[PDB]
Amino acid sequence: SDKIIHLTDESFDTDVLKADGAILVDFWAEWCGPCKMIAPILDEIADEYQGKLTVAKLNIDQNPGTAPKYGIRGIPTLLLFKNGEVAATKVGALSKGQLKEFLDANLA
DSSP states (O other): OOSSEEOOTTTHIIIIITOSSEEEEEEEOTTOHHHHHHHHHHHHHHHHTTTTEEEEEEETTTOOSSGGGGTOOSSSEEEEEETTEEEEEEESOOOHHHHHHHHHHHHO
8 A cells, every 4th residue: 555564474573563663453354344444544544643653454364374363353353552562452343533532542
């Protein structure tokens, strides 16, 4: 894309775990309606939170190894990582206004 990291199972450690800051990871799948709903909202957030965080997306079908490590069940699941460590968990779709509030509250 532009500002969004397209993660793989192989690239996850470097991209998320070794990253010096906050990474909002989206676990999602193409068949998942709610996941496709939040995709354009993630684009806006990627834009708007430039220099605060990076948005990263892991498709759980193309990359089946990573999500079991984080107990992911329902999708979309959004995980806020701060320097390799999960700080906050959001399961299910949510609006832009809601995502903003989730991020602002957990980024501090």
